[PDB]
Design an enzyme around this catalytic site. Structure first.
Site, PDB file in Angstrom:
ATOM      1  CD  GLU A   1      -2.920  -1.427   2.450  1.00  0.00           C
ATOM      2  OE1 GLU A   1      -3.034  -0.500   3.124  1.00  0.00           O
ATOM      3  OE2 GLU A   1      -3.661  -2.555   2.261  1.00  0.00           O
TER       4      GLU A   1
ATOM      5  CD  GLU B   1      -4.554  -8.024   1.749  1.00  0.00           C
ATOM      6  OE1 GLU B   1      -5.363  -7.361   2.190  1.00  0.00           O
ATOM      7  OE2 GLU B   1      -3.426  -7.956   2.018  1.00  0.00           O
TER       8      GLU B   1
END
Ligand SMILES: [Mg+2]
Ligand SMILES: [Mg+2]
Length: 351
Positions: free
Chosen positions: A150, A256
């Site tokens: 991220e 995910e």
């Protein structure tokens, strides 16, 4: 009878045996009972939901907390599962002591330039020692590393975390170089992010990785978190994301995956699983049908598809639902329901 239980039906990973891994995010306490039976039957890959985060492994400098991570590695070994690592470097879930200078104050507040120079050196050395220690411990078990997580800002450009403020982009460069150095040539090094289907975020990640590859940084692939929903994002935007990174010579992994019943934020969450209308599970099954057909269509460019959990009874989306509905509310994002029975979505991805 009702829908059969997850342990009665055809294995997901066997269905996709020639195409990509099928993985699940797990906690150490999920490794017995029905959850373990389901994991053994349906998945050939694991990732630790929380036990390998930087704050979980080195909450204080030199104080290593291996127990929960080791238990997951042990299960993966026993049942011959692949293992993704979540995660080496992340602006979140990282112990505060990393960014504290030698006087106890935050590194981002320093103004002396030679002291700042020294802080960048110290921070990178601490990062490099964290990576070295972890990769040396787990290199024979981990088959895909989320080296950084991220690092792209949703507003655009690089996320201006404390990593960025102190080191610029060098924390990314040094992170991949260290993981490669201690994992060896055969370690598989990934950059992971969410909303990688959003075109403007997709392009920011593409531009970063292309630049980094040109400077010789060893990046093997892109992780697509795929925290999606019944409504977003479009199949077409998903395909475009996968294809753009494949065009850079990069592997893709779905890391995910979960499909919320709700938009963002999950206002108006249902309070009980019985209240969820079957219209919704059918919309979810149509969604998962098109999604895994895209995955199959692109299966030579996708090595692994991991769900962020096993069944609907344990998912961080329940936390988020309660957060936006005053303490109550529930989400149901998988192909196995909260009683471990298969859902409409299961049949549509097993076909
Ligand atoms: Mg593949
Ligand atoms: Mg299907």
């Amino acid at each position: 009878n009702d829908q059969p239980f997850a342990w009665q039906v055809a294995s997901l990973s066997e269905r996709y045996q020639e195409q990509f891994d099928i993985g699940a995010a797990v906690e150490p306490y999920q490794l017995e009972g029905r959850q373990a039976q389901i994991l053994k039957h349906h998945y050939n890959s694991l990732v630790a939901e929380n036990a390998m985060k930087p704050v979980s492994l080195q909450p204080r400098e030199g104080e290593w907390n291996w127990e929960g991570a080791d238990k997951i590695v042990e299960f993966a070994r026993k049942h011959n599962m692949e293992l993704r690592f979540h995660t080496l470097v992340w602006h979140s879930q990282v112990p505060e002591w990393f960014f504290i200078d030698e006087n106890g104050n935050r590194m981002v507040d320093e103004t002396d330039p030679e002291k700042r120079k020294a802080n960048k050196q110290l921070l990178l050395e601490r990062m490099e020692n964290h990576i070295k220690t972890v990769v040396e411990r787990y290199k024979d078990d981990v088959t895909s590393w989320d080296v950084v997580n991220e690092v792209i800002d949703d507003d655009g450009g690089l996320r201006e975390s404390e990593w960025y403020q102190i080191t610029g982009t060098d924390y990314i460069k040094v992170a991949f170089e260290t993981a490669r150095k201690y994992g060896g040539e055969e370690a598989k090094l990934y950059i992971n992010d969410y909303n990688t289907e959003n075109p403007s975020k997709r392009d920011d990640l593409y531009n970063l990785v292309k630049d980094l590859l040109e400077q010789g940084v060893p990046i093997d692939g892109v992780g697509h978190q795929s925290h999606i929903s019944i409504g977003r994002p479009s199949i077409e935007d998903t395909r475009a994301s996968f294809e753009k990174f494949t065009s850079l010579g990069l592997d893709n992994q779905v890391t995910e995956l979960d499909m919320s019943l709700y938009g963002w934020p999950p206002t108006g969450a249902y309070t009980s699983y019985d209240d969820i209308p079957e219209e919704l599970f059918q919309a979810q099954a149509d969604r998962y049908d098109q999604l895994f057909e895209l995955y199959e269509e692109l299966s030579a460019t996708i090595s692994s598809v991991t769900f962020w959990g096993i069944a609907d009874n344990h998912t961080w989306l329940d936390d988020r639902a309660r957060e936006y509905n005053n303490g109550v509310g529930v989400d149901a994002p998988f192909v196995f329901d909260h009683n471990y029975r298969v859902k409409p979505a299961y049949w549509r991805i097993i076909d």
